[PDB]
Write a protein that binds this ligand. Structure first.
Ligand SMILES: *C[n+]1nc(-c2ccc(F)c(F)c2)c[n+]2c1NCC2
Ligand code: NA
Ligand code: NA
Ligand SMILES: [Zn+2]
Length: 265
């Protein structure tokens, strides 16, 4: 039985997707929810914003996991090996994992939008503020997390993404994981670090309002072949009815009492 017949655990189907989440996670209707549409002409340039400092040379990737909602590439976050600081931030944030959101078709998949335009996918590099000691404590704080969001447009292949693409055959179904040591996340970045920033939330339940979002202006180009292989993953576990892992994105939420800032003019 597919989940709709079995359990109302949250997901991305018609019967458990974003329009339902508020019933079990009422903060879904909160005051600083993500994602949002980035209206490029109304985001204000803030000359007090610093360049973003991304220090990933010493990163220790560990494992890639299909968690039934996306796949996470996990990192050792027990030391300041892979850290994000500067930009809008006043602390040091350790990389814990990255994951993507993507569509069933190239014209959808991103969570943030830019002037209402959707990208084929969006990469989230999730970091937590070291003053809180652990991720679980950080998600009890309004400055607990910093997420670096990067858009994926379809065009030329992204060579630094290919190791991710190549391993997906080995984590097809929920609960499968594979070794993913020796992976360099610097290969997922665009050239420019110019960004928009605003206060928001996790985009998956529990939707906690802990995130300083840092969304890069420059998308990365990926090939259609790269993103279409993401779409061969499964939401289900092995031996359960097959549900392709596609359209695992939350749509844009109301901006409410927030103004997006830009690091660039
Ligand atoms: C696949 N599956 N389906 C069911 C299911 C039982 C009544 C699914 F009225 C349904 F719609 C009535 C039960 N389970 C499975 N797999 C494990 C148990
Ligand atoms: Na090292
Ligand atoms: Na700040
Ligand atoms: Zn995400």
């Amino acid at each position: 039985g597919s989940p709709e017949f079995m359990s109302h655990h949250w997901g991305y189907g018609k019967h458990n997707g974003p329009e339902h989440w508020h019933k079990d996670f009422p903060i879904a209707k909160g005051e600083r929810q993500s994602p949002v549409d980035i209206d490029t002409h109304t985001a204000k340039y803030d000359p007090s914003l610093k360049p973003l400092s991304v220090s990933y040379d010493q990163a220790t990737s560990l494992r890639i996991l299909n968690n039934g909602h996306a796949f996470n590439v996990e990192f050792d976050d027990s030391q300041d090996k892979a850290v994000l600081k500067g930009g809008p931030l006043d602390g040091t944030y350790r990389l814990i994992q990255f994951h993507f959101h993507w569509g069933s078709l190239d014209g959808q998949g991103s969570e943030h939008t830019v002037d209402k335009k959707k990208y084929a996918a969006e990469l989230h590099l999730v970091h937590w503020n070291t003053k809180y000691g652990d991720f679980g404590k950080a998600v009890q704080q309004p400055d607990g997390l910093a997420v670096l969001g990067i858009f994926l447009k379809v065009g030329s292949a992204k060579p630094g993404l290919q190791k991710v693409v190549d391993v997906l055959d080995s984590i097809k179904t929920k609960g499968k994981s594979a070794d993913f040591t020796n992976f360099d996340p610097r290969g997922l970045l665009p050239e420019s670090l110019d960004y928009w920033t605003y206060p928001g939330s996790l985009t998956t339940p529990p939707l906690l309002e802990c995130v300083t979002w840092i969304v890069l202006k420059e998308p990365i180009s990926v090939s259609s072949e790269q993103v279409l292989k993401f779409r061969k993953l499964n939401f289900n576990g092995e031996g359960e009815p097959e549900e392709l892992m596609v359209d695992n994105w939350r749509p844009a939420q109301p901006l409410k009492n927030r103004q997006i800032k830009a690091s660039f003019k």
